[PDB]
Structure 1
Amino acid sequence: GLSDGEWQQVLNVWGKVEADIAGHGQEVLIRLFTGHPETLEKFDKFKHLKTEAEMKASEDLKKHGTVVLTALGGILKEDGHHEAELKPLAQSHATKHKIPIKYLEFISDAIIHVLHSKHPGDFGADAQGAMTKALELFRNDIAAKYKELGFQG
């Protein structure tokens, strides 16, 4: 993930892109296509364009550049939003309840144990592997939030 400061930098820069999204979009695609002409082959609508001046004059290329950067902006904003979801829970557990990361592991093991006990026939190896991994990813996320709160070691 990104740190809180890193996310701020990402969102700040993207506000500048959004102030001229069309121009950014155009320049990005032109830069892509001139540095890596093989990428232009993938765009049926304008793979015939041969020069930068031809690319600049293409209204469709400009439209597509906007579509691409708009979609990416959304993706980045959603990533940032998702990474912020556990902030309040990590805050309360780190500083109010005072819970080591290790205790999150203990409760994860307990969850797995209970599921196995209560669901004979319905919590097979694959299902158990999936849940184990989901809970591990959760713990890692909380650990990264702890780090943003000044707990590392």
Structure 2
Amino acid sequence: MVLSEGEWQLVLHVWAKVEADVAGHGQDIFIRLFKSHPETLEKFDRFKHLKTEAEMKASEDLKKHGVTVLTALGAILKKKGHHEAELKPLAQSHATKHKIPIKYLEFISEAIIHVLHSRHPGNFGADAQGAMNKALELFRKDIAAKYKELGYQG
């Protein structure tokens, strides 16, 4: 898929708001993911023991991880589709070390969209959400293609 420049400049406009508080947004997103899809928590040896949202909010380790995640994704979005180099190491670790099925990337996409909708209604009307959806779809289709080349595709 190709995004128009107008779609990228809906994506980067709302992303600029997220970047005012990267840790806060990272926490919201992971809690939403772990609540909506508990099976995903199982993939983190580091966080599997968290039982409640309170404990998730209280974890400084999860907060740090959310920051790493969003920083990496933000580096990707800012490339506007020219993200082949950034994707290679992420695909390799998620395919071979962590073993993350595409389906779970669909789940965190949903979590991201849910949090941007909740926190930034004014900058995330229908057109901006459609743009963000296309950007994340692009990300998932490119990572899926790398998964396949790497021998994981799943």
Structure 1 residue aligned with 2:19: 18
Structure 1 residue aligned with 2:82: 82
Q: Deviations along 1:83-134, whole A, 9 cap, x unmatched?
A: 9xxxxxxxxxxxxxxxxxxxxxxxxxxxxxxxxxxxxxxxxxxxxxxxxxxx
Structure 2 residue aligned with 1:53: 54
Aligned positions of 1:4-153 closer than 5 A: 4-78=5-79, 80=80, 82=82
Q: Residues of 2 paired with 1:58 and 1:81: CA distance?
A: 34
Deviation of 1:82 after TM superposition, in Å, equals: 3.0
Structure 2 residue aligned with 1:3: 4
Q: Deviations along 1:34-92, whole A, 9 cap, x unmatched?
A: 000000001111110010000000000000001001100001111x1739xxxxxxxxx
Stretches of structure 1 that go unaligned for 5 or more consecutive residues are 84-153
Fraction of identical pairs, as percent: 77
Q: Residues of 2 paired with 1:19 and 1:45: CA distance?
A: 27
Q: Secondary structure at the match of 1:82?
A: coil
Structure 1 residue aligned with 2:148: none
State the aligned residue count: 82
TM-score (norm 1): 0.52
Cα-Cα RMSD: 1.4
Matched to 1:46, the amino acid is: F
Q: Residues of 2 paired with 1:38 and 1:48: CA distance?
A: 13
Matched to 1:82, the amino acid is: H
Matched to 1:51, the amino acid is: T
Report which structure shows greater RCO (CA 8 Å, sep ≥6): 2
Structure 1 residue aligned with 2:140: none
> Which one has a bigger Cα radius of gyration?
1
Stretches of structure 2 that go unaligned for 5 or more consecutive residues are 84-154
Q: Secondary structure at the match of 1:45?
A: coil
Q: Secondary structure at the match of 2:64?
A: helix
TM-score (norm 2): 0.51
